[PDB]
Structures are given as structure tokens and as C-alpha cells.
Amino acid sequence: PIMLLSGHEGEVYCCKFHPNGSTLASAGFDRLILLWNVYGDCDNYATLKGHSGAVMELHYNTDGSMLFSASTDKTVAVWDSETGERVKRLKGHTSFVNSCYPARRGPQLVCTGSDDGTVKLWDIRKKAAIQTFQNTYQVLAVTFNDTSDQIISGGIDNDIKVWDLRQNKLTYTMRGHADSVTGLSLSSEGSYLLSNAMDNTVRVWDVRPFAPKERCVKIFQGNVHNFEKNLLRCSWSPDGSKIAAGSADRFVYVWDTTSRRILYKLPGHAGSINEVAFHPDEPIIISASSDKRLYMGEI
Amino acid sequence: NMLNLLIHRKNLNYLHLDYNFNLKPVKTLTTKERKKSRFGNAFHLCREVLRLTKLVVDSHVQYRLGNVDAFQLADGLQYIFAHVGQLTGMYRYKYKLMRQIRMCKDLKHLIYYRFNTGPVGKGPGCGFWAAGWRVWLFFMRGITPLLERWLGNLLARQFEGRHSKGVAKTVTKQRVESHFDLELRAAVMHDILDMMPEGIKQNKARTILQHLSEAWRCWKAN
Amino acid sequence: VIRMVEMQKDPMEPPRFKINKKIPRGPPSPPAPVMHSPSRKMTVKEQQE
Amino acid sequence: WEDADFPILCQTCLGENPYIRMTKEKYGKECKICARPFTVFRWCPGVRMRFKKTEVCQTCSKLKNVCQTCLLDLEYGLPIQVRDAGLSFKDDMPKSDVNKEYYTQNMEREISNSDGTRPVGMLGKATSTSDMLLKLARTTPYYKRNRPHICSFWVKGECKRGEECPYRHEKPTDPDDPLADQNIKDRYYGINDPVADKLLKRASTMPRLDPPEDKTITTLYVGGLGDTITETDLRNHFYQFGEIRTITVVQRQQCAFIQFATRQAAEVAAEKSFNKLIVNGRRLNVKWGR
Amino acid sequence: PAHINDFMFEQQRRTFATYGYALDPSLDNHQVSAKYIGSVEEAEKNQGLTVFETGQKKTEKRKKFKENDASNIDGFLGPWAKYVDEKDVAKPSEEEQKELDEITAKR
Amino acid sequence: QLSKQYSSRDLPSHTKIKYRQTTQDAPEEVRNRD
RNA sequence: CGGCCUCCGAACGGUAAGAGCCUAGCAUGUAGAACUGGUUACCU
RNA sequence: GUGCUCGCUUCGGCAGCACAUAUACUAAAAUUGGAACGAUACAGAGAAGAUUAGCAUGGCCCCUGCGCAAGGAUGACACGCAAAUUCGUGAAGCGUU
Ligand SMILES: O=P(O)(O)O[C@H]1[C@@H](OP(=O)(O)O)[C@@H](OP(=O)(O)O)[C@@H](OP(=O)(O)O)[C@@H](OP(=O)(O)O)[C@H]1OP(=O)(O)O
Ligand SMILES: [Mg+2]
Ligand SMILES: [Mg+2]
Ligand SMILES: [Mg+2]
Ligand SMILES: [Mg+2]
Ligand SMILES: [Mg+2]
């Protein structure tokens, strides 16, 4: 079925699954985080509270045991999916922290991209900062590398940047996007990384020990920007088979890794789609849009 | 101003409401105007309530101008509340008021006959106006929803117009007989003169009804 | 792209328009076909009756 | 009472900015024609332009197919009389009080059974846009409509409101002009509206190809041909329109002379092509040869 | 029935109002690019500056008065300070005046 | 075309519907009975 | 040791009903407003 | 316009940052039209011989009333062929096949 979900008062910016594929988390302008059950009637059990600013990015851990959520109010937050309660308020960010990423399968460690001009590394236990690479400017998305030893970030200056956690210098800078990059997501290959950018083009890259020195692999057309400049986010499928993107055009764009063909431009929405979520188990799609509700498409 | 705007909107130029809320004609009115210019209990209940309040606020204005006194104001207010019957003439329009009126008498007999227990005399100077004030405030608590309904209806009817299309008036006590005969002869016309016919051409039902009325008079005459 | 906003209603405002207008009732619906059984005859004697 | 989703208005009258902000008022005013209460929508046309308002019911609009405030037709955009004449329509909407209220009631009951998609009645049976209509049509938005009125004060000198004078502080138009007094009721009913008569005289003085005297003059002269045309192209211009009997493509004068097989066919072709047979961008002049 | 964000619509509208060009709103099923609609050359030469975004403008602001000491009895213009480059009367003159008299007679 | 007139008898009254209780005769029992 | 103290006022139903007549009021405060000027040639 | 730049940097300005972000049926008008149950004058009251009580029905008739009550001459108005699909005998006379 289409299964449209509602109950959010303002835009929903972020929607993602339990890494179980059991529960649903969505969040946006309303400054709180709603949860649902993916199966049955797609019903709502819990609501997490506390974040004073807009929830700009929610992120799971790789088991699903604690929840990370970047807020507009200069703070990140980690909470207990067990309870929904705050364990840590990552303060210290000197501006709008938009992006958050918990280290997967490494020591518990977090990279946060913010509007201060720094990327910040934090340990959850110490209540203190680890490292911080002030390049010059706002960083809009951040993701680790599966070694938990490089950190990738995308901002306003269009050159995707990667730092080595040990030498702490600009390890890898990649170029070719015509305007600001808005989204990074590294496939479960640990290798292929996906980049949305409102210049209307999406790109694919690969962080390896050895890469061709110019690793701009695949390129797809279709995404849109407009006077909104909303933050646009992408994802790989669980399989690295289909790329899903949203855009300010009300069209859910589903493409393939293989033939780069347009498998879908699906209508159904009313406002810009900000985030598409793939089920880690199923062919289930969840769209978070600025029309103050969500969609549950089955393909 | 509201009541005058009402009077003059209905195009009743021959009447005027003076400054103590008395309504007075400035001509001698023919029948057509004696009829066109009759008003209801909504208009008059509003008139009389405003007259009570003007009496009160004007006693206070006399106090504030320097004309009277603190004691004369207090006793004059007590007076006002005890004698609403002889100052307003409200009971004419909602006669249930006498509940209140009798109450403000009973209180006065209490207070007075405890006020003047000693050398204090039977004279005017007794203003302890809490009790009657309370009484008329509770009256107003009750009357405001009523009057808001009545005035809403009056204003609607004055601005939209009265609905003479689907009135559908009940059957009361003056229309019991006429209605019995309406329905009896409707029934008779349904009954055979259209459902046991085969006097095809024109079944003459208007003449069978004449037979029905004459059979009834013949019953009555034996 | 247009922004709809609904204008405030003044609480103290009487109705604005005259409601009571009379007109004859409209034409009904297209007459349905009269599906009867064929008529039989009335002799002269019955019409006498 | 009517109830709408948006106005239905000319692009001229809707404004210039792509982004407009507009207010609705439920049961706000009375249609000057339908006589019943409507919902009234008000928008600011542009910078320093008067706020405009929808001035006719949505049914009173769908019936005659016009813009609820601009009042001009929806596709072409001429006065209602002009469009009616060009569609050769005969609109029978009643005039007297009781008959008109009754007609409005039943027309509304029947338009309730619609899809909200196209006008009801002959306005679907008359959409064959004649070249006269297309020829009179406005081309770009005559946005002089939305400037404010004439300041009685600033016409007498008095508009002491500085530059904020609530009306265009220019010269008042001479009231003798026919384009001055056009009551809304007539402009909707199309009875003696001066702009309609002026535009009709303009359409009568507009160039159209003239017919000859003799029936035997079945050679048609097309002037301004150019040497990018072929005899087969002149055919394709005058081939399926009937039958052509011969074609002389005069290259020494850049013209053509088409002998036809049916007089009405060639007449329709050439008159319909008069200065407007635009094949390969050439203004050919269709006339009857000697 | 769209649902859009609020700061952005007013930003674009005020842009088109005071600058004359705007990021066109067409959300077409054929992917158009960001095109400045209206006074396109003005958007080009002005670098797309919005009325809300601060930008360098040496434009001569009209001269105004400033009497903001509220102790002078007829002194304080305060927030109600008139513009100094303003006129002191507003009227039409001899030719247009007689012409308007002639028109009001013609009417 | 909705009027703002009003009536003394159209005030809210008896605003809850009584339902037939467990012992009175509820549609369950009469569904059962012989 | 005995006490017991109702009420109370206003309207309609009565002083015709009508067509014309003419002038205040009282309502409106709008919508719209314009555009030009193309022509002939070969053999008896 | 307010403040701060460890801004020039004097205490003149300039600049930068922050803070502050879109009123309004635009009218003092100018229009344009209809009513006052007012005069004016006409006019002039059901039933049945006469004089009179009323309660209704019908609807492009209203008015007073909060009114689904009541009243308004029983509120007014409500009548000249209130003719509808459709004929044929009996006799005579005249002209015709
Ligand atoms: O006019 P009323 O409403 O009936 O009130 C008065 C009055 O009270 P005010 O002082 O407020 O006018 C008298 O009071 P005094 O003469 O005592 O000062 C007096 O009451 P008294 O009987 O006590 O004199 C009199 O009554 P009555 O006519 O029987 O003397 C009467 O009050 P009632 O309600 O007692 O009549
Ligand atoms: Mg009587
Ligand atoms: Mg009689
Ligand atoms: Mg009666
Ligand atoms: Mg009588
Ligand atoms: Mg009657």
C-alpha cells in the first residue's frame, strides 16, 4: 500500500529505520522525535523530547541501542532507544550542528558537522572533544570511513574533504561538483560513497587504500534545487543496488547503481522530499517530506 | 446611540428616545404608525436595563462633580437598588422580576430594623447597599444570555428579513377543528376517489366531498 | 505560488445580506417512463354504475 | 452562497510577480449579476498597484466563461460581446428580476452536476476560434489596468497627501469619450458596451483579402513569395484545401498564381491565408489574379 | 495544494518586489535550472542581491531631518521625522488646473 | 444561505443518547433469546 | 411558655385597508478605458 | 537608528559586525442609484335580506413580535365562455356513379 504517516506538526527533515528493521524514527522542525512501528498499521508508540532547536539529522548506532540526533541549538544528543532518555548532550559546538555520525564497529566515537567552521570528533564517555579540523567554513554533511580512521565532510566550497584521524591533515580532497554538496552516504560496501548536491547532479566516489587519484565514478541526473535550498540527502540500498534521492520537486527519485537509469520518479508528495529511508531487510521505502508527513512505499 | 440607531433604521422618524431612555412620539400617529412602531420585549427590556445603569452612573457623576456628598451618594445608591420597581418600570416586560423585587424589600426590612435599633431614626440616611446590589447582579447573570438571544434574533430579522417561506406552524388550540377537517377530507380524497375509482373520465371527487359534508350535516340534524 | 489567508471576522457585525427571496421551484427531473400493464376496457354499463 | 478554491482570473489581472499573497473572505459581497452572496478574494497586483477583487460569482463566471474581475474572455480576451459575435453565439440569459433569479437558480443547480473543468453549454459548442477572434486578441499584458484612480483632490489641486495621493494625480479623462461610462451590468450582458463597438469597427477596418467580380477569375495572386518556396510547397498550401488546377510560381517577380478547381475552396484558402499564410516565414499576399 | 516553507517565500517575493528579479518558482516535471525571472539582466548585474540580504549599495538615501530631543515642546519629531527632501504642498498647476475645470464642466 | 435567527426550542437539550443497558433488553440478549 | 399575617403589572385584541404621487434619506464608493498605411506582364 | 570593533582611529568621518524586516476595503472624496405608509389626492371593508364572530387552505404578498405563541378588516389577494382527448342516428331535398 501507499501507507502515508502523519502526526508531525512541521516539516520532517530526517526519517530512518531501526537497523533491526523494527522501529521507525522521524524528526524535523517540531523539535521532537517521533517513533513508529514499521509493520502492522505503521503505528506510533513513543515520542522523544528535549531538543530545543530543529532536529536536523537523526542517526542510529549500528545495533540500534542508542540514538544520535543533531539539533539546531548548537548541540548533538545521544539518547537510549531503550528508554528514549538523554544520556549525553554533546555541547561545545560553537554554532548550528547539522550533521552527526556515530562510528560503526569501532570504539564509540562521533563526528559532527556544524555551521561553525569545524568538524568535531567526540567520545561519548569523556564529555570532552577528541579532534576538530577547522578547514574554513560550514560543513553540511559528515560520514566516517569504515576503518574509523578517515572522516569525510561536505560543505559550501564543493571540494569533498577527508581527514586522517592520526595525522589530522586534509587527507583526501575531491573535486568536480559545480555547487554545494548536501549529502554523503557511504554504502555498506565500506567503499562506495554517495553525494547529493543541489547543482542538480549526484555523484559516486570510492575511498580505498588505492584509488585512481580521481575517483569520480558514476553520475546521475535529476535532482533539483530552488529558492528553498533545503538540505537534500541520499542513501544507498542495503545491497548497493538502488540509490534513492529526494528533491524540491515532489518526486521520489529511485535510480540503480548498475545502469544509472531512472527506475522511478514517483509522485505522491505535496512538499519537498528531504529524506528517503531504505529498509535494511525489505523493499520498503519511507519518504520524509516538508509536507508535514511521511510515505511508506513498497517496491 | 444603539437604541436610537435601531429606531431610525426601521425608518420610524416620528419617535425619539430621550436622554433618560423614555420613548416618546413627536406627532400624533395614525393607526399605520401606531402599528408599525410597536416594539417588543427585547427592545424594552434593554431600554429598562440601560435606564437602571444610567441612574447608577449618574448618581456617581453627581458625587464626582461635587454636588452631593459621600453619604448622600451611598444612601442614594441604596435607595436606587431598593426601589427599582418605582424608578424603572422593568416588571412590565419580564414580570418574573418580582422575585428580585420582593427580595430587595425583605432585605430592607431586615437592615433597616437592625440599622435603627437605638437612637438612630426612621429617616433617609441609611446606605448599606451591598445586599440589593448583589441581588440585581445575580438577576443580570441570569438575564444576559436571554437578552443576547432575543437581541440576536431581532437584529438578524432586521438585517436579513423575516422568513415567511417554510414557517411550518404548529397545530395549537384555535386550529384544532379546522385542521381536523383539512386532514379528514385529504384522507377521503386519497381514499376512494383515487384508489377505488374506475369512474375514469373525471372521477368527480369534488362532488363526493359535497356528499360527505352533507351526510355530516344530516347526521347532526338526525 | 499563492498564500491563502482567511480574513478576520468582526465579532460585532450583524448579518450583511437579505436572505428571504422567493422564487417558484425549479423543473423536476426528467420524467421516468410509465411501465404499466396494458389497460383493460370499461363497458358502458360499468361507467353507468 | 458560492464557495471556491481560488479566483479564476486573467493573467493580466493576476499580476507580475510569480509569488502572490491573497486574502479570502467567506460570503463577503453580492455578485453584481447573480445577485447572491459570494466569497471574495483580494490580492495586491504589483508594487504601487491597487488591490483588486473578484467581482462576480464563480457560477456567473463559468456560465459566460470570463475572468471574475477582469471580465474579459478567458482564452482570447476580448469584451464579452466581441467574443459572442466572433463565436456567432446567442446567449439567452434573462433580464427581468424574477425571471433572472429563477434562471440563475436552475442554471446553478445544473452546474452543480459538472466537473468544474470547462464552461457549461454553448461555450463548449462554440470554441471554434475564428481568425477574427485570434486577430483581435491582446498580445502582451496591458498592465495599465491596475494603476490607481484619478485624485479628485489632485484634479482640483487638493491632494495634500504629498506623494501618497490615493489616486493617479494626472489629468482627468474627458467624459464625452465613449470609453468612459461602461456599467458592469451591461458589460456582462453585452448590450451597448462602447469598447465592444470600437473594437468591432477596428476589426472591420482590419485588412482581409478582397473577392473579385467575375466567377471566371479563378487565378489567385499570392504576392511576396521568395525563392525558398517550391511549386510543391505552394501546392501543399493549396492542395488539400480543395483542388488546384495549375500553379505558376513567378520567379521574375517573387509571386505565385494558383488556378483552382473549386471557387469556394480557393476562396476559403486565400481568405484564410490573407497575409497569414506563413510558410517558411514569407508574408504572401493572397488575392485574385487578373 | 502546496506546502512550502515560510521565510523563503517572503524572501523571494520581497526580492522580486524591490529588486525586480526573482528565482523563478516553476517546479516543472522537466528539470529546469535556477533562472532569474523578471529583470534578468538586473539580477545578473546586481549579483542576485536580495532585499533581506545585506549588500553594498552606495545609493543616495533621501535626505531627512532629525529632531530627537524630546524636551523641546514643539521640538520632538522623533520617529515622526519628515523627509528633508520633501515638498511642502501638493497641487496641480495653471494649465492642468484650468484643464481639469474644463473637464469637470464637460462632465 | 444560513440564517442567524434562532429559537427558544433549538437550544441544546437531552444531548446524550441513552443506550439500552445490560439488563433492560440489549440487542445481545434478544439476539440470544428463545 | 408561647410564636402562624396570601396577593400587587404590561401588550394585543378598536378606532380601516389600499393603488398612484413626489422629494430626502439610505444605500454605491466599484469593474473597465483604445494602438499603424503590400501590387502586372511574353508569341497571331 | 543602537551598540561593539583593541577598525581606521581621531575623538571628525568612514567602514565592518550584530540588532531591527513589508501597513493598507489606500480616499478628506467623487460618483451612482432607491426607498418616507409623509403629503397629495383618489380610493373604500367576506359568507347570506339586514347587522355581525371568526378558524383555516394556496403563494414571485407582506407587516408587528424573541417566537414553532399571538396579532394585523376572518391581515391582503384569491371568479363573467370556471368547457379537455372524441361521436352517431332518423327523416327529407338536391346534384352525382
Ligand atoms: O417605599 P418602600 O419601598 O415601601 O420603602 C419605604 C421606606 O424605605 P426607604 O427609606 O428606602 O424609602 C420607608 O423607610 P423609613 O420610613 O423606615 O425610613 C418605610 O419603611 P418603614 O415602614 O420602616 O418606615 C416605608 O414603609 P411604611 O410605608 O410601611 O412605613 C417603606 O418601606 P416598606 O416596604 O416598609 O413600606
Ligand atoms: Mg379584529
Ligand atoms: Mg353580508
Ligand atoms: Mg391570524
Ligand atoms: Mg372584527
Ligand atoms: Mg386570512
PDB file of N, CA and C in Angstrom, chain D residues 205-255:
ATOM      1  N   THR D 205     -12.206  47.389 -40.055  1.00  0.00           N
ATOM      2  CA  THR D 205     -11.187  48.087 -40.831  1.00  0.00           C
ATOM      3  C   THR D 205      -9.897  47.290 -40.980  1.00  0.00           C
ATOM      4  N   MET D 206      -9.773  46.151 -40.305  1.00  0.00           N
ATOM      5  CA  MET D 206      -8.558  45.355 -40.403  1.00  0.00           C
ATOM      6  C   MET D 206      -8.442  44.723 -41.789  1.00  0.00           C
ATOM      7  N   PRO D 207      -7.221  44.527 -42.289  1.00  0.00           N
ATOM      8  CA  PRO D 207      -7.056  44.006 -43.654  1.00  0.00           C
ATOM      9  C   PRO D 207      -7.507  42.557 -43.771  1.00  0.00           C
ATOM     10  N   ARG D 208      -8.386  42.307 -44.739  1.00  0.00           N
ATOM     11  CA  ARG D 208      -8.725  40.965 -45.179  1.00  0.00           C
ATOM     12  C   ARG D 208      -8.799  40.969 -46.699  1.00  0.00           C
ATOM     13  N   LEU D 209      -8.536  39.807 -47.295  1.00  0.00           N
ATOM     14  CA  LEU D 209      -8.402  39.720 -48.743  1.00  0.00           C
ATOM     15  C   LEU D 209      -9.728  40.018 -49.435  1.00  0.00           C
ATOM     16  N   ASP D 210      -9.643  40.684 -50.567  1.00  0.00           N
ATOM     17  CA  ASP D 210     -10.904  41.068 -51.175  1.00  0.00           C
ATOM     18  C   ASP D 210     -11.317  40.071 -52.252  1.00  0.00           C
ATOM     19  N   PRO D 211     -12.618  39.935 -52.492  1.00  0.00           N
ATOM     20  CA  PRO D 211     -13.098  38.992 -53.511  1.00  0.00           C
ATOM     21  C   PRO D 211     -13.248  39.677 -54.856  1.00  0.00           C
ATOM     22  N   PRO D 212     -13.096  38.939 -55.958  1.00  0.00           N
ATOM     23  CA  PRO D 212     -13.236  39.568 -57.280  1.00  0.00           C
ATOM     24  C   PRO D 212     -14.687  39.671 -57.724  1.00  0.00           C
ATOM     25  N   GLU D 213     -14.908  40.206 -58.923  1.00  0.00           N
ATOM     26  CA  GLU D 213     -16.244  40.282 -59.508  1.00  0.00           C
ATOM     27  C   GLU D 213     -16.620  38.992 -60.234  1.00  0.00           C
ATOM     28  N   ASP D 214     -15.802  38.574 -61.200  1.00  0.00           N
ATOM     29  CA  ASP D 214     -16.177  37.515 -62.127  1.00  0.00           C
ATOM     30  C   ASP D 214     -15.927  36.135 -61.529  1.00  0.00           C
ATOM     31  N   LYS D 215     -16.860  35.216 -61.797  1.00  0.00           N
ATOM     32  CA  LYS D 215     -16.687  33.832 -61.379  1.00  0.00           C
ATOM     33  C   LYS D 215     -15.539  33.161 -62.118  1.00  0.00           C
ATOM     34  N   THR D 216     -15.227  33.629 -63.325  1.00  0.00           N
ATOM     35  CA  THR D 216     -14.183  33.019 -64.135  1.00  0.00           C
ATOM     36  C   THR D 216     -12.783  33.456 -63.727  1.00  0.00           C
ATOM     37  N   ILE D 217     -12.655  34.386 -62.787  1.00  0.00           N
ATOM     38  CA  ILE D 217     -11.333  34.814 -62.309  1.00  0.00           C
ATOM     39  C   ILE D 217     -10.956  33.830 -61.208  1.00  0.00           C
ATOM     40  N   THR D 218     -10.506  32.647 -61.631  1.00  0.00           N
ATOM     41  CA  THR D 218     -10.127  31.574 -60.722  1.00  0.00           C
ATOM     42  C   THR D 218      -8.615  31.406 -60.659  1.00  0.00           C
ATOM     43  N   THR D 219      -7.883  32.467 -60.975  1.00  0.00           N
ATOM     44  CA  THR D 219      -6.455  32.547 -60.719  1.00  0.00           C
ATOM     45  C   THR D 219      -6.247  33.480 -59.538  1.00  0.00           C
ATOM     46  N   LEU D 220      -5.489  33.017 -58.548  1.00  0.00           N
ATOM     47  CA  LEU D 220      -5.298  33.732 -57.292  1.00  0.00           C
ATOM     48  C   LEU D 220      -3.841  34.148 -57.186  1.00  0.00           C
ATOM     49  N   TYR D 221      -3.609  35.447 -57.001  1.00  0.00           N
ATOM     50  CA  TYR D 221      -2.264  36.009 -56.981  1.00  0.00           C
ATOM     51  C   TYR D 221      -1.763  36.109 -55.545  1.00  0.00           C
ATOM     52  N   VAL D 222      -0.659  35.424 -55.263  1.00  0.00           N
ATOM     53  CA  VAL D 222      -0.004  35.427 -53.962  1.00  0.00           C
ATOM     54  C   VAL D 222       1.284  36.225 -54.107  1.00  0.00           C
ATOM     55  N   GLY D 223       1.328  37.405 -53.491  1.00  0.00           N
ATOM     56  CA  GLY D 223       2.466  38.302 -53.636  1.00  0.00           C
ATOM     57  C   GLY D 223       3.428  38.236 -52.459  1.00  0.00           C
ATOM     58  N   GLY D 224       4.723  38.266 -52.773  1.00  0.00           N
ATOM     59  CA  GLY D 224       5.748  38.130 -51.759  1.00  0.00           C
ATOM     60  C   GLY D 224       6.108  36.685 -51.479  1.00  0.00           C
ATOM     61  N   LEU D 225       6.530  35.965 -52.517  1.00  0.00           N
ATOM     62  CA  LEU D 225       6.736  34.522 -52.428  1.00  0.00           C
ATOM     63  C   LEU D 225       8.147  34.168 -51.963  1.00  0.00           C
ATOM     64  N   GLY D 226       9.159  34.674 -52.653  1.00  0.00           N
ATOM     65  CA  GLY D 226      10.527  34.329 -52.341  1.00  0.00           C
ATOM     66  C   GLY D 226      10.942  33.002 -52.954  1.00  0.00           C
ATOM     67  N   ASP D 227      12.255  32.848 -53.127  1.00  0.00           N
ATOM     68  CA  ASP D 227      12.823  31.708 -53.830  1.00  0.00           C
ATOM     69  C   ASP D 227      13.250  30.594 -52.884  1.00  0.00           C
ATOM     70  N   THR D 228      12.678  30.548 -51.684  1.00  0.00           N
ATOM     71  CA  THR D 228      12.819  29.407 -50.791  1.00  0.00           C
ATOM     72  C   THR D 228      11.580  28.523 -50.804  1.00  0.00           C
ATOM     73  N   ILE D 229      10.608  28.835 -51.654  1.00  0.00           N
ATOM     74  CA  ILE D 229       9.376  28.071 -51.783  1.00  0.00           C
ATOM     75  C   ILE D 229       9.469  27.200 -53.025  1.00  0.00           C
ATOM     76  N   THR D 230       8.741  26.090 -53.008  1.00  0.00           N
ATOM     77  CA  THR D 230       8.645  25.216 -54.162  1.00  0.00           C
ATOM     78  C   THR D 230       7.225  25.257 -54.711  1.00  0.00           C
ATOM     79  N   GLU D 231       7.083  24.824 -55.967  1.00  0.00           N
ATOM     80  CA  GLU D 231       5.752  24.664 -56.539  1.00  0.00           C
ATOM     81  C   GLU D 231       4.962  23.611 -55.774  1.00  0.00           C
ATOM     82  N   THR D 232       5.639  22.546 -55.335  1.00  0.00           N
ATOM     83  CA  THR D 232       5.020  21.560 -54.460  1.00  0.00           C
ATOM     84  C   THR D 232       4.685  22.137 -53.089  1.00  0.00           C
ATOM     85  N   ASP D 233       5.425  23.148 -52.634  1.00  0.00           N
ATOM     86  CA  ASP D 233       5.095  23.788 -51.367  1.00  0.00           C
ATOM     87  C   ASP D 233       3.863  24.674 -51.500  1.00  0.00           C
ATOM     88  N   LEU D 234       3.791  25.469 -52.571  1.00  0.00           N
ATOM     89  CA  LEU D 234       2.564  26.203 -52.861  1.00  0.00           C
ATOM     90  C   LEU D 234       1.388  25.250 -53.020  1.00  0.00           C
ATOM     91  N   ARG D 235       1.630  24.081 -53.613  1.00  0.00           N
ATOM     92  CA  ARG D 235       0.615  23.035 -53.636  1.00  0.00           C
ATOM     93  C   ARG D 235       0.163  22.698 -52.221  1.00  0.00           C
ATOM     94  N   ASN D 236       1.081  22.186 -51.402  1.00  0.00           N
ATOM     95  CA  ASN D 236       0.759  21.834 -50.024  1.00  0.00           C
ATOM     96  C   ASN D 236       0.049  22.960 -49.282  1.00  0.00           C
ATOM     97  N   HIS D 237       0.230  24.210 -49.718  1.00  0.00           N
ATOM     98  CA  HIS D 237      -0.578  25.301 -49.180  1.00  0.00           C
ATOM     99  C   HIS D 237      -1.998  25.258 -49.733  1.00  0.00           C
ATOM    100  N   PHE D 238      -2.150  24.899 -51.008  1.00  0.00           N
ATOM    101  CA  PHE D 238      -3.435  24.942 -51.700  1.00  0.00           C
ATOM    102  C   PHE D 238      -3.716  23.622 -52.418  1.00  0.00           C
ATOM    103  N   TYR D 239      -3.442  22.501 -51.753  1.00  0.00           N
ATOM    104  CA  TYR D 239      -3.659  21.183 -52.339  1.00  0.00           C
ATOM    105  C   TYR D 239      -4.814  20.439 -51.696  1.00  0.00           C
ATOM    106  N   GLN D 240      -4.764  20.233 -50.385  1.00  0.00           N
ATOM    107  CA  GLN D 240      -5.832  19.555 -49.668  1.00  0.00           C
ATOM    108  C   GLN D 240      -6.977  20.488 -49.319  1.00  0.00           C
ATOM    109  N   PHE D 241      -6.838  21.783 -49.605  1.00  0.00           N
ATOM    110  CA  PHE D 241      -7.871  22.763 -49.296  1.00  0.00           C
ATOM    111  C   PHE D 241      -8.996  22.685 -50.314  1.00  0.00           C
ATOM    112  N   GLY D 242      -8.978  21.643 -51.137  1.00  0.00           N
ATOM    113  CA  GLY D 242      -9.836  21.552 -52.299  1.00  0.00           C
ATOM    114  C   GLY D 242      -9.061  20.894 -53.419  1.00  0.00           C
ATOM    115  N   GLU D 243      -9.124  21.458 -54.620  1.00  0.00           N
ATOM    116  CA  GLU D 243      -8.238  21.059 -55.700  1.00  0.00           C
ATOM    117  C   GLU D 243      -7.660  22.304 -56.354  1.00  0.00           C
ATOM    118  N   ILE D 244      -6.381  22.239 -56.713  1.00  0.00           N
ATOM    119  CA  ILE D 244      -5.747  23.271 -57.523  1.00  0.00           C
ATOM    120  C   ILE D 244      -5.617  22.748 -58.945  1.00  0.00           C
ATOM    121  N   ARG D 245      -5.837  23.633 -59.913  1.00  0.00           N
ATOM    122  CA  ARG D 245      -5.794  23.251 -61.317  1.00  0.00           C
ATOM    123  C   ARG D 245      -4.446  23.520 -61.964  1.00  0.00           C
ATOM    124  N   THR D 246      -3.718  24.516 -61.471  1.00  0.00           N
ATOM    125  CA  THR D 246      -2.434  24.916 -62.030  1.00  0.00           C
ATOM    126  C   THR D 246      -1.750  25.819 -61.018  1.00  0.00           C
ATOM    127  N   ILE D 247      -0.437  25.956 -61.170  1.00  0.00           N
ATOM    128  CA  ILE D 247       0.351  26.812 -60.292  1.00  0.00           C
ATOM    129  C   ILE D 247       1.479  27.417 -61.109  1.00  0.00           C
ATOM    130  N   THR D 248       1.536  28.745 -61.138  1.00  0.00           N
ATOM    131  CA  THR D 248       2.605  29.470 -61.811  1.00  0.00           C
ATOM    132  C   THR D 248       3.405  30.185 -60.737  1.00  0.00           C
ATOM    133  N   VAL D 249       4.613  29.698 -60.473  1.00  0.00           N
ATOM    134  CA  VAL D 249       5.496  30.314 -59.492  1.00  0.00           C
ATOM    135  C   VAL D 249       6.381  31.290 -60.259  1.00  0.00           C
ATOM    136  N   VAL D 250       5.989  32.563 -60.255  1.00  0.00           N
ATOM    137  CA  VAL D 250       6.695  33.610 -60.984  1.00  0.00           C
ATOM    138  C   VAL D 250       7.937  33.972 -60.174  1.00  0.00           C
ATOM    139  N   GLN D 251       9.107  33.568 -60.674  1.00  0.00           N
ATOM    140  CA  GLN D 251      10.379  33.879 -60.038  1.00  0.00           C
ATOM    141  C   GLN D 251      10.947  35.217 -60.485  1.00  0.00           C
ATOM    142  N   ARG D 252      10.455  35.771 -61.591  1.00  0.00           N
ATOM    143  CA  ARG D 252      10.872  37.098 -62.024  1.00  0.00           C
ATOM    144  C   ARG D 252      10.191  38.213 -61.238  1.00  0.00           C
ATOM    145  N   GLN D 253       9.224  37.879 -60.387  1.00  0.00           N
ATOM    146  CA  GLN D 253       8.589  38.866 -59.529  1.00  0.00           C
ATOM    147  C   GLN D 253       8.393  38.376 -58.104  1.00  0.00           C
ATOM    148  N   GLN D 254       8.781  37.137 -57.793  1.00  0.00           N
ATOM    149  CA  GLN D 254       8.628  36.550 -56.462  1.00  0.00           C
ATOM    150  C   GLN D 254       7.155  36.482 -56.061  1.00  0.00           C
ATOM    151  N   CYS D 255       6.347  35.877 -56.924  1.00  0.00           N
ATOM    152  CA  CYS D 255       4.923  35.769 -56.654  1.00  0.00           C
ATOM    153  C   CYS D 255       4.431  34.419 -57.161  1.00  0.00           C
TER     154      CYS D 255
END
